Design a protein around this ligand. Structure first.
Ligand code: MG
Ligand code: MG
Ligand code: MG
Ligand code: MG
Ligand code: MG
Ligand code: MG
Ligand code: MG
Ligand code: MG
Ligand code: MG
Ligand code: MG
Ligand code: MG
Ligand code: MG
Ligand code: MG
Ligand code: MG
Ligand code: MG
Ligand code: MG
Ligand code: MG
Ligand code: MG
Ligand code: MG
Ligand code: MG
Ligand code: MG
Ligand code: MG
Ligand code: MG
Ligand code: MG
Ligand code: MG
Ligand code: MG
Ligand code: MG
Ligand code: MG
Ligand code: MG
Ligand code: MG
Ligand code: MG
Ligand code: MG
Ligand code: MG
Ligand code: MG
Ligand code: MG
Ligand code: MG
Ligand code: MG
Ligand code: MG
Ligand code: MG
Ligand code: MG
Ligand code: MG
Ligand code: MG
Ligand code: MG
Ligand code: MG
Ligand code: MG
Ligand code: MG
Ligand code: MG
Ligand code: MG
Ligand code: MG
Ligand code: MG
Ligand code: MG
Ligand code: MG
Ligand code: MG
Ligand code: MG
Ligand code: MG
Ligand code: MG
Ligand code: MG
Ligand code: MG
Ligand code: MG
Ligand code: MG
Ligand code: MG
Ligand code: MG
Ligand code: MG
Ligand code: MG
Ligand code: MG
Ligand code: MG
Ligand code: MG
Ligand code: MG
Ligand code: MG
Ligand code: MG
Ligand code: MG
Ligand code: MG
Ligand code: MG
Ligand code: MG
Ligand code: MG
Ligand code: MG
Ligand code: MG
Ligand code: MG
Ligand code: MG
Ligand code: MG
Ligand code: MG
Ligand code: MG
Ligand code: MG
Ligand code: MG
Ligand code: MG
Ligand code: MG
Ligand code: MG
Ligand code: MG
Ligand code: MG
Ligand code: MG
Ligand code: MG
Ligand code: MG
Ligand code: MG
Ligand code: MG
Ligand code: MG
Ligand code: MG
Ligand code: MG
Ligand code: MG
Ligand code: ZN
Lengths: 126, 206, 70, 50, 119, 87
RNA sequence: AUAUUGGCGAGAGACCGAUAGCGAACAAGUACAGUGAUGGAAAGAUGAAAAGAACUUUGAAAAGAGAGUGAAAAAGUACGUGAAAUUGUUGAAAGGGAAGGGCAUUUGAUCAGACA
RNA sequence: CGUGGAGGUCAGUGACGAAGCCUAGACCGUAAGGUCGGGUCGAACGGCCUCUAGUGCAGAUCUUGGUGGUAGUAGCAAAUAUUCAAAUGAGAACUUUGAAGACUGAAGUGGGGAAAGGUUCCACGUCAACAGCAGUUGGACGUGGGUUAGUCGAUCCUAAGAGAUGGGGAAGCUCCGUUUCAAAGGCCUGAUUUUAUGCAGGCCACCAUCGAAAGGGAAUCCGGUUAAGAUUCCGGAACCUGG
RNA sequence: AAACUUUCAACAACGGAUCUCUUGGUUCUCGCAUCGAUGAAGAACGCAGCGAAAUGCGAUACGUAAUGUGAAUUGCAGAAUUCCGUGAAUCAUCGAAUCUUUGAACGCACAUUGCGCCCCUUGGUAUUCCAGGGGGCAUGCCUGUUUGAGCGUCAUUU
């Protein structure tokens, strides 16, 4: 149960803020959970997905496949992996859009800033 | 109060082979010529527009209020009522079910559930939980999306943690004896709520 | 293009806010060139055309593919 | 009309520029919703009223 | 590319003017090229570069004036605080707090006392 | 002849474009605008015309300056600059 | 302490659910009418994903026929469901200046139940 | 009896198919209606106690939308008129070129303009809609190109008239007045040889401004040139105004 | 006997009801006090690599500067140096700017991109004419400065 006077349970308002969320706001909404191994490694559950990260699909038809996030397609609330695609009938190839909540992060791309994030959440890093 | 009425539309009088509701004037848009205002008109004002000064609340004599909650309390004894009301008390130790004042001091949900279970509420707790459904209404999109039954009502004399250790368990409610509310004692006006009384609360009753 | 090859005339779209003096001076300063006379018109899209005739010392064709077009 | 003021001509210019089909690439944008240009005017269907 | 301000502010006044003229020559050329070409995005960046340089020339000229007016009655209106028309009329703290000699005495002698009930 | 033969003589404007409101209700001979009142210092409007008002009130345009007053109010009409921080 | 169908920020409803709710859920005070004051609409929904039909064949083309994609084309940018009026084809029947209806049975078609 | 929402309950139904829709198949009810099967369908929904109302349609020359019979019907008949052949094209009564027959008959169906329109002009592409047959054509559709002035107009002037200002009315939006009951303004040079422009004469008291693309008015012509501009470009030869 | 008409059903039309949706509306409640001559509200016209609109912006034109974030934007193209970084972004925030022509709208006009005056400066052999660049000149009223008017009026000259 909410308890504060400044959070709204309202469904209309919630859908509205989702679908019209600004780019910066979607980076955080698009988080992926870490892998069992990465979670022990860094003592941390999840992180906003970020491009050159390495990732395992764990729901849906692509369950079990893996690769590198090639773009975080924030406009579409979706992520693309160079290694997970549709081959069309005309032989042309086309990315498939995946949701971070359906991935698992198996290798992080690290910055000063990424490390600084993991630390701010009280994690530990190899 | 202005809907249906944001036109300058006029009747056309008779002699024009056409019903005499007012009609929007002007030309060139498809709206013009059309029935206006009346309640049978697309875009008309409704019959008897609802008004905020409708009566919403209701006065009840304080003493009758009390008669009712007194009756309701009396019925939380009387197993068959409690049974009839839903409520899975077919194997609780006894009724009224009174429990140690130590309950009011539990801070932790998991301990709180443990205790309710021990004293016999396992099956009512399970009934809520087994009963979540999407509501059949349009209610479903007016902040009223799910449905579920009512669990036991835990009553205490002093909140020393219990109202907070219980607030997250589905269907379980808590009340101070000093208050005590008819909406909870007889949900939907059906006598019989399963009530678990702390001793401290059971004796404050008199 | 033809006016350039045949009439020693550079043709510019030019600011609405500018007059025959300002166009002349501008072309001169920007192009090291000498202007005989400047005709102008307002296009049917809200822009100004300047027919700029250079003096006979200059060769507008030459001077147009020095600025870099064709 | 035919010996005009700059004001009318300025307006006519804006009018000529707004007179064209949808730029077709727009049709392909994510969540695009515009089929065609619904504000297309024509000199012999609707008058400008200056 | 595109110029950065924080590098522009380390340049002399006359360097910045000169880079302005350089960019403008360049923009001029890009525009010649643009019409021999299916597409020409780089033009965008040179014209945002001009924007930047002008901003930085204006910045400097302004804080130059701002400072040689800092600390005098009367400075040009477009360096005066904006606030709001009302706020900008509006008694100053000083004027608002003006109190009569008779008031002042009364305030001194008989101020609101801190007190409490019990005994 | 009061109908269509006479509609053929309609080729002269009673109103042109109004400088202040753009509308083509600037009555030429009267030299005043039937919509916004130009060149009256004030703007035409009437309480018996709520639609017209709504067609023209503040917010139906860009609000080029007023847009920003509430942010500026919110932060107490700040002056100066933001400083700096880290990572 | 009082007011508040305006403004900015918020939390809500035994409220409406696209002919309803504000006129406007959409490039709506738009498009469009009027010399002018003013008047003022219609218009939401493929699918999880365009995977928006490669390729063959007939055709001047639009398209058709195959193929293909898809959980489904009985979802094909005419797109969820897809009523009625009204229409085409197929099948069955009746019909000497209307048709339709009531009680009853023949004839045809069709079907439940119950036997053990 | 039935409908939208509400409290309770049946730990009710459901992607192994909710709701909805179809169905001279079944069953219950005197009836309002209720139940089933089958087909279609795709995400939600119902029984019972109770609460609540924007709660039940055949009508209102009802409202909005859709749809028929009428009916392949009335009709597509004013303005004298069309024809042969080639070419192009999937396709030619209707496009293009040739031929022929005619018409308008300079009070024009010719050659230009004002108002109005606003790109319709011109070129290339080209037919889904539109041009009440057609269409390869178009004032349509797509993409482009195109309007050049010291001398042509505007701009200047004044006309009927409009309309600020000192003022006078009016609660006021504003109304009156226009030289009016006003301390209403600027030119010509001299005086400067600190110096740039203060004073020395004398005048002139005319006291706004808007209002004509037909009235008044400084000044340009011929020849050539474009797909589309031309008294505007090019060639030549002039003229006016200011300095 | 067909055709035709009429009834039923099946598949196909026509049409868009119904069911289920809902970033809209409607009503209630709580908190707050900020438009404008420092040029508001409103208008016009413009501005993107490829936009007609809506949204945004003003010749610095779907943006400049600053700050926070920490790698996108995405219809296509693009840059490529921007990824352990004074640093991506149609991001958030916003304190500094730019802000065409207008509008109470202010040199005069305005169905005109019409017509003056003043100052500084540049160019044309120029205090005087022309052209370019910058900066100015509305009205009422208040305090003050300066210059003045009137036998309205005081004193003081010889
Ligand atoms: Mg918190
Ligand atoms: Mg986090
Ligand atoms: Mg997704
Ligand atoms: Mg009313
Ligand atoms: Mg009738
Ligand atoms: Mg209504
Ligand atoms: Mg329902
Ligand atoms: Mg339920
Ligand atoms: Mg009490
Ligand atoms: Mg040559
Ligand atoms: Mg000209
Ligand atoms: Mg017409
Ligand atoms: Mg019309
Ligand atoms: Mg940048
Ligand atoms: Mg001030
Ligand atoms: Mg009459
Ligand atoms: Mg008429
Ligand atoms: Mg008139
Ligand atoms: Mg008047
Ligand atoms: Mg005015
Ligand atoms: Mg309110
Ligand atoms: Mg509340
Ligand atoms: Mg509506
Ligand atoms: Mg209703
Ligand atoms: Mg409506
Ligand atoms: Mg919506
Ligand atoms: Mg429309
Ligand atoms: Mg749908
Ligand atoms: Mg639909
Ligand atoms: Mg969709
Ligand atoms: Mg096919
Ligand atoms: Mg299906
Ligand atoms: Mg379907
Ligand atoms: Mg298709
Ligand atoms: Mg369908
Ligand atoms: Mg019968
Ligand atoms: Mg019978
Ligand atoms: Mg009932
Ligand atoms: Mg009901
Ligand atoms: Mg209702
Ligand atoms: Mg079903
Ligand atoms: Mg039937
Ligand atoms: Mg049965
Ligand atoms: Mg079935
Ligand atoms: Mg679905
Ligand atoms: Mg009831
Ligand atoms: Mg009703
Ligand atoms: Mg009835
Ligand atoms: Mg009916
Ligand atoms: Mg009837
Ligand atoms: Mg009746
Ligand atoms: Mg009817
Ligand atoms: Mg009808
Ligand atoms: Mg026919
Ligand atoms: Mg016939
Ligand atoms: Mg006839
Ligand atoms: Mg013919
Ligand atoms: Mg003849
Ligand atoms: Mg004759
Ligand atoms: Mg003719
Ligand atoms: Mg002509
Ligand atoms: Mg026209
Ligand atoms: Mg033509
Ligand atoms: Mg065709
Ligand atoms: Mg046509
Ligand atoms: Mg036709
Ligand atoms: Mg045809
Ligand atoms: Mg065209
Ligand atoms: Mg064109
Ligand atoms: Mg002349
Ligand atoms: Mg002039
Ligand atoms: Mg007057
Ligand atoms: Mg005049
Ligand atoms: Mg004249
Ligand atoms: Mg004349
Ligand atoms: Mg000639
Ligand atoms: Mg030419
Ligand atoms: Mg011609
Ligand atoms: Mg000549
Ligand atoms: Mg000569
Ligand atoms: Mg001379
Ligand atoms: Mg026979
Ligand atoms: Mg069927
Ligand atoms: Mg519905
Ligand atoms: Mg949905
Ligand atoms: Mg709401
Ligand atoms: Mg509240
Ligand atoms: Mg206004
Ligand atoms: Mg945009
Ligand atoms: Mg871009
Ligand atoms: Mg930084
Ligand atoms: Mg932003
Ligand atoms: Mg600027
Ligand atoms: Mg003025
Ligand atoms: Mg001007
Ligand atoms: Mg100036
Ligand atoms: Mg004074
Ligand atoms: Mg004095
Ligand atoms: Zn106006």
């Amino acid at each position: 149960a909410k308890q504060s006077l400044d959070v709204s349970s309202d469904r209309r308002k919630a859908r509205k803020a989702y679908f019209t969320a600004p780019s910066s706001q979607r980076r955080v909404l698009l988080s992926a959970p870490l892998s069992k191994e990465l979670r022990a490694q860094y003592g941390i559950k999840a992180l906003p997905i970020r491009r050159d990260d390495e990732v395992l699909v764990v729901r849906g038809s692509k369950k079990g496949q893996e690769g590198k996030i090639s773009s975080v397609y924030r406009l579409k609330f979706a992520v693309q992996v160079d290694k997970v695609t549709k081959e069309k009938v005309n032989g042309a190839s086309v990315p498939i859009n995946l949701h971070p909540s359906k991935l698992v992060i198996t290798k992080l791309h690290l910055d000063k800033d990424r490390k600084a994030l993991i630390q701010r959440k009280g994690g530990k890093l190899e | 109060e202005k809907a249906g009425h944001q036109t300058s539309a006029e009747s056309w009088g008779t002699g024009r082979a056409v019903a005499r509701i007012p009609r929007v004037g002007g030309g060139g848009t498809g709206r013009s010529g059309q029935g206006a205002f009346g309640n049978m008109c697309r875009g008309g004002r409704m019959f008897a527009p609802t008004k905020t000064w409708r009566k919403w609340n209701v006065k009840v004599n304080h003493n009758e209020k009390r008669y009712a909650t007194a009756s309701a309390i009396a019925a939380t004894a009387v197993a068959s009522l409690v049974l009839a009301r839903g409520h899975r008390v077919e194997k609780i130790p006894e009724i009224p079910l009174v429990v140690s004042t130590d309950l009011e001091s539990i801070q932790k949900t998991k301990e709180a559930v443990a205790a309710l279970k021990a004293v016999g509420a396992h099956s009512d707790l399970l009934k809520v939980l087994k009963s979540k459904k999407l509501r059949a209404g349009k209610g479903k999109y007016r902040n009223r999306r799910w449905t579920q039954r009512r669990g036991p009502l835990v009553v205490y004399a002093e909140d020393n943690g219990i109202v907070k250790a219980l607030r997250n368990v589905p269907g379980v409610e808590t009340a101070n004896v000093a208050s005590l509310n008819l909406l909870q004692l007889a949900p939907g006006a059906h006598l019989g709520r399963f009530v678990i009384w702390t001793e401290a609360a059971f004796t404050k009753l008199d | 293009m033809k006016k350039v090859e045949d009439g020693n005339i550079l043709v510019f779209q030019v600011s609405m806010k500018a007059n025959k003096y300002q166009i002349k001076k501008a072309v001169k300063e920007l192009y090291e060139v000498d202007v005989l006379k400047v005709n102008t018109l307002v296009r049917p899209n809200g822009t100004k055309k300047a027919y700029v005739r250079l003096t006979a010392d200059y060769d507008a064709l030459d001077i147009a593919n020095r600025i870099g077009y064709i | 009309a035919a010996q005009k003021s700059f004001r009318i001509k300025q307006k006519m210019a804006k009018a000529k520029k707004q007179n064209r089909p949808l730029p077709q690439w727009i049709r392909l944008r994510t969540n695009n919703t515009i089929r065609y240009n619904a504000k297309r005017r024509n000199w012999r269907r609707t008058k400008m009223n200056i | 590319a595109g110029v950065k301000a924080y590098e522009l502010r380390t340049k002399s006044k006359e360097q910045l003017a000169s880079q302005l003229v350089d960019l403008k020559k360049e923009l001029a050329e890009l525009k010649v090229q643009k019409l021999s070409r299916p597409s020409l995005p780089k033009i965008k960046t040179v014209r945002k570069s001009i924007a930047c340089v002008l901003t930085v020339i204006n910045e400097q000229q302004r804080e130059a004036v701002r400072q040689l007016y800092k600390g005098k009655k009367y400075q040009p209106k477009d360096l005066r605080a904006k606030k709001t028309r009302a706020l900008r009329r509006a008694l100053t703290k000083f004027e608002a707090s003006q109190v009569t000699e008779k008031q002042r005495k009364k305030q001194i002698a008989f101020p609101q006392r801190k007190y409490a009930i019990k005994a | 002849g009061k109908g269509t033969p006479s509609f053929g003589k309609r080729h002269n404007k009673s109103h042109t474009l109004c400088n202040r409101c753009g509308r083509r209700s600037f009555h030429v001979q009267k030299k005043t605008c039937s919509s916004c009142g130009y060149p009256a210092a004030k703007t035409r409007s009437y309480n018996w015309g709520a639609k017209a008002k709504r067609r023209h009130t503040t917010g139906t345009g860009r609000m080029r300056y007023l847009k920003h007053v509430s942010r500026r109010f919110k932060n107490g009409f700040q002056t100066g600059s933001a400083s700096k921080a880290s990572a």
